[PDB]
Amino acid sequence: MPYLLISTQIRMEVGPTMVGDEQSDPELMQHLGASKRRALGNNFYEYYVDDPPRIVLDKLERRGFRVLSMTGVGQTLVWCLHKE
Amino acid sequence: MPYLLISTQIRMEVGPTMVGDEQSDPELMQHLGASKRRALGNNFYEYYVDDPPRIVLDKLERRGFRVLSMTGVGQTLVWCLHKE
Amino acid sequence: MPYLLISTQIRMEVGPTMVGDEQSDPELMQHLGASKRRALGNNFYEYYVDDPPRIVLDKLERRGFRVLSMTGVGQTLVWCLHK
Amino acid sequence: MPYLLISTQIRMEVGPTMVGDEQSDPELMQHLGASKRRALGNNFYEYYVDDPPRIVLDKLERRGFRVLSMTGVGQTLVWCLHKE
Amino acid sequence: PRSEEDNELNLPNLAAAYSSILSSLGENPQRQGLLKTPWRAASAMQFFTKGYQETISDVLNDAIFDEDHDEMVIVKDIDMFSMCEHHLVPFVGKVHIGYLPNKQVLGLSKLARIVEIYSRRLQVQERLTKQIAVAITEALRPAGVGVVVEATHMCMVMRGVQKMNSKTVTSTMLGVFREDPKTREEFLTLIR
Amino acid sequence: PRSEEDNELNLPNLAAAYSSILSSLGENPQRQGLLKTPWRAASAMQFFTKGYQETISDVLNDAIFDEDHDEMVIVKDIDMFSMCEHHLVPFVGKVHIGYLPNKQVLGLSKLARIVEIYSRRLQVQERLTKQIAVAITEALRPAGVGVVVEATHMCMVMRGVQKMNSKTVTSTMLGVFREDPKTREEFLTLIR
Amino acid sequence: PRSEEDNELNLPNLAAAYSSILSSLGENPQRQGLLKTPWRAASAMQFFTKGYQETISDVLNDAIFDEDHDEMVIVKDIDMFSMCEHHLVPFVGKVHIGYLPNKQVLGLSKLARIVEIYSRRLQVQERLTKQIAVAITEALRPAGVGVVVEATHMCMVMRGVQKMNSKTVTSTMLGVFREDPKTREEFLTLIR
Amino acid sequence: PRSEEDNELNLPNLAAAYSSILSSLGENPQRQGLLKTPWRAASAMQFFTKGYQETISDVLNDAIFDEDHDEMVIVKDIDMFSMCEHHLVPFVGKVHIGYLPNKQVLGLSKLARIVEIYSRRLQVQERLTKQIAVAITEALRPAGVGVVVEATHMCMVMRGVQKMNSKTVTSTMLGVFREDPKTREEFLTLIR
Amino acid sequence: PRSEEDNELNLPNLAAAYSSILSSLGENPQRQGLLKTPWRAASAMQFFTKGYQETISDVLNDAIFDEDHDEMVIVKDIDMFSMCEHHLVPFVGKVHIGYLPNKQVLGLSKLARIVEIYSRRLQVQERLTKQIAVAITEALRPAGVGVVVEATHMCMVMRGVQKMNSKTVTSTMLGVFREDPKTREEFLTLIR
Amino acid sequence: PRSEEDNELNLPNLAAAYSSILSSLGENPQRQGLLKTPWRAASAMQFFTKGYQETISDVLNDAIFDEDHDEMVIVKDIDMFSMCEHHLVPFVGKVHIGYLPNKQVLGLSKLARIVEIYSRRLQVQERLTKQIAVAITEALRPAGVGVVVEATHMCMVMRGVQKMNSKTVTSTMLGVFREDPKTREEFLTLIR
Amino acid sequence: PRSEEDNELNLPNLAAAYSSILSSLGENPQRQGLLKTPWRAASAMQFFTKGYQETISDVLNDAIFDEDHDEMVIVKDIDMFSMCEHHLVPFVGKVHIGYLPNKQVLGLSKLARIVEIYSRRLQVQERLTKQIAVAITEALRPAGVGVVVEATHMCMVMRGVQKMNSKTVTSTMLGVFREDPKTREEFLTLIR
Numbered sequence A, B, D: 001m002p003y004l005l006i007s008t009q010i011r012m013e014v015g016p017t018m019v020g021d022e023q024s025d026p027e028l029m030q031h032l033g034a035s036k037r038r039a040l041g042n043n044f045y046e047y048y049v050d051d052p053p054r055i056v057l058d059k060l061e062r063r064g065f066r067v068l069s070m071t072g073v074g075q076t077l078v079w080c081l082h083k084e
Numbered sequence C: 001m002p003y004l005l006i007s008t009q010i011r012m013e014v015g016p017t018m019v020g021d022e023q024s025d026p027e028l029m030q031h032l033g034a035s036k037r038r039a040l041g042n043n044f045y046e047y048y049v050d051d052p053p054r055i056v057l058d059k060l061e062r063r064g065f066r067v068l069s070m071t072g073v074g075q076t077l078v079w080c081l082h083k
Numbered sequence E, F, G, H, I, J, K: 001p002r003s004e005e006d007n008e009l010n011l012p013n014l015a016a017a018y019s020s021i022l023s024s025l026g027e028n029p030q031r032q033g034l035l036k037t038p039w040r041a042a043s044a045m046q047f048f049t050k051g052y053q054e055t056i057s058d059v060l061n062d063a064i065f066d067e068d069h070d071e072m073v074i075v076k077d078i079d080m081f082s083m084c085e086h087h088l089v090p091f092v093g094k095v096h097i098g099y100l101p102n103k104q105v106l107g108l109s110k111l112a113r114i115v116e117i118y119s120r121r122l123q124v125q126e127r128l129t130k131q132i133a134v135a136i137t138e139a140l141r142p143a144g145v146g147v148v149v150e151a152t153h154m155c156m157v158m159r160g161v162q163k164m165n166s167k168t169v170t171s172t173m174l175g176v177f178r179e180d181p182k183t184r185e186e187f188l189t190l191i192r
């Protein structure tokens, strides 16, 4: 599983940070301290952490991931990481 | 055919993922499990998969594609991949 | 002329793709099959192709260009290529 | 001074291109043919050129700069260059 | 599609059913005021259901012009009268259509004739909204379409929940009307 | 008067007539949207004609109090829903009622309940207006009564003359509402 | 009265006159937009003057009801489309009719059908207003009649004085609508 | 361009055609009210088509100023009266224009005169809208232009679909009015 | 009159009855939301009926002046909040007071204080209207008085007949306000 | 849920508590106008809290139709009457509900019935708003939901702060109604 | 700047020019109504151009307060009366000013006093709008300014195009009012 997508809403200084979908690696989610939930209004499960994205990026780097790209879409900041 | 463009609407955790246009490599579309359709309101055909973008990126990695850039445009998340 | 800027409006699957301005390399524009025009409402000329951006990116790769960055601005998708 | 930020409003084909702030390298601004001004409504000075961004990027390449990233913010296209 | 021969054939059967209704409600079908009702209720019901008789291509009397202009075209406040298929009571309102053509522009009145093919049937507002939009999209193949129907359902006002001030708004946005925030904001503003 | 036993009996006869209508219009009575329609439309028509099941004495519920209130009493904007007896389509609107009592005063809702006995039947606006005014006159023996019914007829808007903006206003002025210019003007101003 | 045979006979003559008009202005009758114009213009003019084809007796399709409902009957906001006989350009607005019956009552939609006979002709607003009031008066022999016509004349807005906001109101008051100050105040209040 | 001598030359031919129309409709061209009508209708038609006599260059009267104003300039609620080229019946409404100048600013009334050149012709609303937008764009070469035309077509209201409340809205957005969401949003708001 | 000592004495009894109501409705009186509700509802009910603690003499704080101004004095749109004595649900609206003094004039605010003595009680609109009018009539001995109360009764909108748009208007016209047609017409105009 | 057996059992307890309230306020529950008030106030409070007797699936009545309609569905201006749990005084207003179906579509009236299950209870506006939104979300599993509730709180207008013109607006935006700027601006435009 | 001494000095010359105008128009300057017209017209014209007598420094009256309020401050519907420099006829309307302060806050009435310096001059609307925006920007150096002027030009209404309903809207957006969509949308909504 080389690619990873993480995100946060505007105010990058604060969480939550979305770190996965239903088919995400459960061990990686457990390592990040992520919890699984289906938020009201969504028809899908997600993994999230209370940490701001900077903490998550440092945690993932210690797991071989590297930020390939970062973008804004609406009020969301998204990071695309690749295991390398 | 070195360049590839894939996209998804906001909520990156869920599909569909647009993986091609009328002139896309039919074998690559078949490999991704993509279907060809002309959505109501569009005057062009598209190839799409039900999978969220993370699954598609992992499949493209095994096919020799690497993400060069990821951007947001409106409510769309777009990935630009290159065969290298 | 090492840098190039190309763009498309939302629905990247379909063209036109803007491939240049008045001072663009005319041989490169001719190679891409681009036409020059001043669209109504604009006070500048542009070079465009009917092709979707994916076709243009493949053509530019055969001409020595590589995508450095891709971004969205309003409803426009822009690619910054370098020779 | 390794980093540089340049920008243009939507319609990348046409200028002006913002090439600096009050503390910018005056020799680099002079080389680009930039003029300094405080536009009405702004409480800061800026350096600008009439040239579209493509012309400015080619000039900066001959001065040792390379584009690290390009992004859209509102109706602005921004380039982040690094001297390397 | 329904023909005028079918209407002449079924009119006596419709009038007989309406006469039966008059008796089953406890009314006297022989009263002065209730005498011609079976035939009148029956032919009003054929009229509220004309449109089963119609086909898009005949309605569009070749009123497809070549207006090579790149502009938004809106026909708003088109009166709409339909029949609710669940309770058989009218649902009435207005329909506002917008579109961005490609190389073909429709005659203004034909958008209102498209509304009349579908509203003059036993409907659900959602089906009616989509049928109008699909007809514009297929006949013209435009860059985008927007259809907004606003209606009062008698079945929600005269009976049942009896929410006398309630209205139903159904909205279909296709192509640039869905994709572009500027296009949809402009259309939503100009229909007001 | 019509009873609940009358409703249960001949409710299947009404449903039978409505499925016959669905066939006669060229519709498929077996499609999803029309499966319950013959029974839902028959229950609806029974509810729209529920006024036949009521008596003025029962409706008034002994809410006639002997008071000396020498003042004009108005209950305006009473939503009114009725069925035309010529074409079985709705005529909907508002009722404004005013009266000047002598020795008897009516409960405010009882005026709206008197609108309901008569509007919930197959009617004609003129009959409906007169029935409300005579019910009040005979229950209270007041100095005067004014009844104004404004309504949109569906038979004039969805078909026939198709005059989409027209309304029918009917007005009964009895006693001092008819004779006194000051009384009538006061009433017509306060219902605005 | 004008017949459908007269319409078929005069349609080619009316199309030839309209084709001549297109040429007499600087226009090209062979351009795409003007090819069908001579016949659509001729057809529209025949529709705009269809009242010449009808008689007041045909309009009164046995829609008289001997009733004695001693009440004011108003039908307001009747859309009215007529043509000025002085410039051959439309004058469009609304008609508000009222009457106080004696022994007979008219069918609600027939009031609007009376507007249609007289308005669908080459007219002057005053003759149109009078003709509607006389038709009701002779059909019902009522206590009184009020007929109010508010219209915008294109010959006053599009050209000449070009008084863009002006509107003409003509008003006929007969019988008790003229004599009684309470009848006339009530009618004018209730049409507003 | 059409001249005033062309108008004098063709006036008898237009009057003769209108006299022929009166006879073909079943009317008596000798009756008092119709005796001056052929000439008054011919004269009205030439005034309605006076746009054929004008050219942009002439109309603009050199009122193009060199003031470099970085602001949005709007002229809203410009009364517009045009002729339908398909039926020869008026389509009337309002035009709202907006622009963002570069180096040249136009005199305010000249935007209403640009509406007059194109609207006083036999038209389609879409062509009319583009002509105003393109005239402004070529004469001033601005950063952007927005033109919204709002009109009631007499051919959809007095006849055909008879959708008495419908209005056609057409909108052209060029340059920054198309590209910038803030610009289009501010223009659409300030014209309300 | 009801005293503050009476209020302190009866408050626990009122809270106990509200506590009983919560249990009898099937609610858990111990949940967070209902924990303070028996005292909050009891205090609110004492506030809504505070008019029983005040006397018309104390309310009129010697604010009766000997002034000769033969002018119509009106205080309109005085917000009114009362309690229906039949169902114990609010009836809210506005009061409009007019008077023509003959030798005594009242302070403007004292007209709203008069509304407050009588509205803050379990009432019937008719009685409330008359009590306001009699208070002014007896205090000032004027030429005439006009009182108009317009209210929405929650017992007709939220339950029962459920006519959500209906309002009740009661009107007392005394002295010259009843006799003089110019006086009444002037008052009824200036309150709008 | 609360049953009809519970209602018969608790009605006398509610009436007795209301009789006790009348005595505690200083009133005479034996006077003409107060005699039936214990039973009337008791029946009103049962009707006001009838939502406790309802289940979301019973209310839905299997009116979930598996239809593929990619369009916004709004049911607006649904009259909402509720009870403030803190003071036991009504909070009344409107509810505007919008959704974007996924695979299932709800019957229009069932949205108003979902309003009724939760509004007919002792409530806080924010809880009521959330309950309506969650019921739709769990029943249909749509792409998004929007619920806006506007209400006047009698406890803020009739007492306390007594800010007579104030209104409370609550708004829940779920799924694409929260995420998409286009979707939200569209729902918010179409509800006004 | 123009002084009050300059006004007194030039008044006889202005009165003589106005007397000459009365004679040149064909009027009798000796008739009763025109006797004092030269002096009244001369003074009015001096008053209409009084803005020339003012300095933005004196107008501000040191009402600049060093405050770190982080909010949008708007002063809307400021009546504006100016004179057209082309025809010397008034152009009248409203000015809506809005700003986002940096460290300096302006006294509310000084925004209206800035409008008065520039409007009381022979103007062009674009220049006037820019002058108001530049005066707020240079006195306060704020994060952003927005100035919207809406006016009726008597030279476009009383004569020329004679478009009676037209208005000119000019809009200057500086700083964050230009760059931020949230800021611009808020200002434009709040001035409605």
Ligand SMILES: Nc1nc2c(ccn2[C@@H]2O[C@H](COP(=O)(O)OP(=O)(O)OP(=O)(O)O)[C@@H](O)[C@H]2O)c(=O)[nH]1
Pocket: E084, E085, E086, E087, E123, E124, E125, E126, E153, E155, E156, E159, E160, E161, F036, F040, J060, J061, J063, J105, J106, J107, J108, J109, J110, J113
């Ligand atoms: N989406 C949609 N729904 C539509 C129409 C027209 C009607 N309907 C809805 O069909 C449902 C039928 O329900 P039912 O079987 O339970 O009947 P009934 O007990 O009489 O119901 P009710 O009225 O609550 O008493 C109702 O909910 C009705 O509103 C439409 O255009 N679009």
Ligand SMILES: Nc1nc2c(ccn2[C@@H]2O[C@H](COP(=O)(O)OP(=O)(O)OP(=O)(O)O)[C@@H](O)[C@H]2O)c(=O)[nH]1
Pocket: E036, E040, F084, F085, F086, F123, F124, F125, F126, F153, F155, F156, F159, F160, F161, G061, G063, G105, G106, G107, G108, G109, G110
């Ligand atoms: N006084 C009175 N009149 C009433 C109603 C309700 C309806 N009517 C009127 O009865 C007439 C029936 O005539 P008819 O047989 O000719 O029918 P039909 O050919 O279908 O008519 P139309 O639609 O015109 O073509 C119509 O005119 C209708 O409006 C009412 O309350 N009061």
Ligand SMILES: Nc1nc2c(ccn2[C@@H]2O[C@H](COP(=O)(O)OP(=O)(O)OP(=O)(O)O)[C@@H](O)[C@H]2O)c(=O)[nH]1
Pocket: G084, G085, G086, G123, G124, G125, G126, G153, G155, G156, G159, G160, G161, H036, H040
């Ligand atoms: N009472 C009445 N009068 C009517 C109509 C319809 C039109 N008219 C009026 O006949 C007059 C004809 O005058 P004319 O010959 O001088 O014409 P022309 O110089 O072209 O006129 P114009 O430039 O506009 O003044 C005009 O005044 C016109 O308005 C109606 O319904 N009732």
Ligand SMILES: Nc1nc2c(ccn2[C@@H]2O[C@H](COP(=O)(O)OP(=O)(O)OP(=O)(O)O)[C@@H](O)[C@H]2O)c(=O)[nH]1
Pocket: E061, E062, E063, E065, E105, E106, E107, E108, E109, E110, G036, G040, H084, H085, H086, H123, H124, H125, H126, H153, H155, H156, H159, H160, H161
């Ligand atoms: N886009 C556009 N379209 C325009 C005008 C003006 C008119 N039209 C439209 O031309 C069509 C002509 O149709 P036709 O040949 O079939 O005529 P006819 O059967 O008599 O029609 P009708 O009974 O009314 O439907 C109509 O649809 C009409 O509305 C305009 O400004 N813009």
Ligand SMILES: Nc1nc2c(ccn2[C@@H]2O[C@H](COP(=O)(O)OP(=O)(O)OP(=O)(O)O)[C@@H](O)[C@H]2O)c(=O)[nH]1
Pocket: F061, F063, F105, F106, F107, F108, F109, F110, F113, I084, I085, I086, I123, I124, I125, I126, I153, I155, I156, I159, I160, I161, J036, J040
């Ligand atoms: N004159 C006058 N009348 C007033 C009020 C306040 C209320 N009322 C009216 O007294 C009647 C009481 O009826 P009852 O015992 O039969 O009650 P109930 O079956 O629950 O009634 P309902 O509501 O019909 O279900 C109702 O008609 C009510 O509206 C007022 O201010 N002035």
Ligand SMILES: Nc1nc2c(ccn2[C@@H]2O[C@H](COP(=O)(O)OP(=O)(O)OP(=O)(O)O)[C@@H](O)[C@H]2O)c(=O)[nH]1
Pocket: I036, I040, J084, J085, J086, J123, J124, J125, J126, J153, J155, J156, J159, J160, J161
């Ligand atoms: N969020 C929310 N709040 C609600 C309701 C209904 C009511 N409330 C609010 O509860 C508070 C109770 O306060 P309390 O104990 O201090 O009472 P009391 O001093 O007598 O009040 P008051 O004199 O008015 O201040 C008040 O503020 C009231 O408005 C709702 O729907 N949503």
Ligand SMILES: Nc1nc2c(ccn2[C@@H]2O[C@H](COP(=O)(O)OP(=O)(O)OP(=O)(O)O)[C@@H](O)[C@H]2O)c(=O)[nH]1
Pocket: H060, H061, H063, H105, H106, H107, H108, H109, H110, H113, K084, K085, K086, K123, K124, K125, K126, K153, K155, K156, K159, K160, K161
């Ligand atoms: N931008 C701007 N323009 C302004 C004013 C005030 C007026 N004007 C415009 O000056 C032009 C002068 O034209 P001219 O020389 O041709 O005169 P004249 O034949 O009398 O004209 P007209 O009215 O067509 O008959 C007109 O277009 C007028 O509108 C303003 O505030 N801003």
Ligand SMILES: C[C@H](O)[C@H](O)C1=Nc2c(nc(N)[nH]c2=O)NC1
Pocket: E070, E071, E072, E100, E143, E144, E176, E180, E182, E183, E186, H171, H172, H173
């Ligand atoms: C739809 C087409 O691709 C293009 O984006 C257009 N958009 C618009 C337009 N015209 C208007 N008025 N609004 C638009 O959003 N013309 C063309």
Ligand SMILES: C[C@H](O)[C@H](O)C1=Nc2c(nc(N)[nH]c2=O)NC1
Pocket: F070, F071, F072, F100, F143, F144, F176, F180, F182, F183, F186, I171, I172, I173
């Ligand atoms: C009707 C009685 O005889 C008397 O004429 C009254 N008229 C009126 C009245 N009260 C009002 N408000 N209006 C009247 O016209 N009370 C008594």
Ligand SMILES: C[C@H](O)[C@H](O)C1=Nc2c(nc(N)[nH]c2=O)NC1
Pocket: G171, G172, G173
């Ligand atoms: C004026 C003439 O003497 C007569 O009294 C009329 N009055 C009137 C009228 N027509 C109306 N509408 N109103 C009147 O007052 N026609 C004739």
Ligand SMILES: C[C@H](O)[C@H](O)C1=Nc2c(nc(N)[nH]c2=O)NC1
Pocket: F171, F172, F173, G070, G071, G072, G100, G143, G144, G176, G180, G182, G183, G186
């Ligand atoms: C006209 C008859 O003689 C009598 O005067 C009537 N007038 C009136 C009435 N009914 C109303 N509504 N208004 C009147 O003026 N019925 C009878």
Ligand SMILES: C[C@H](O)[C@H](O)C1=Nc2c(nc(N)[nH]c2=O)NC1
Pocket: H070, H071, H072, H100, H143, H144, H176, H180, H182, H183, H186, K171, K172, K173
């Ligand atoms: C159009 C020009 O390039 C620039 O973006 C401007 N936009 C605007 C402006 N002024 C306003 N009022 N609104 C704009 O959107 N002035 C200049």
Ligand SMILES: C[C@H](O)[C@H](O)C1=Nc2c(nc(N)[nH]c2=O)NC1
Pocket: E171, E172, E173, J070, J071, J072, J100, J143, J144, J176, J180, J182, J183, J186
């Ligand atoms: C919600 C779904 O993902 C998609 O974005 C849609 N949005 C919309 C839609 N239809 C309308 N009218 N508005 C939307 O915002 N259909 C589908």
Ligand SMILES: [K+]
Pocket: A008, A009, A010, A011, A012, A013, A014, A015, A016
């Ligand atoms: K965050």
Ligand SMILES: [K+]
Pocket: B008, B009, B010, B011, B012, B013, B014, B015, B016
């Ligand atoms: K997605």
Ligand SMILES: [K+]
Pocket: C008, C009, C010, C011, C012, C013, C014, C015, C016
């Ligand atoms: K594209």
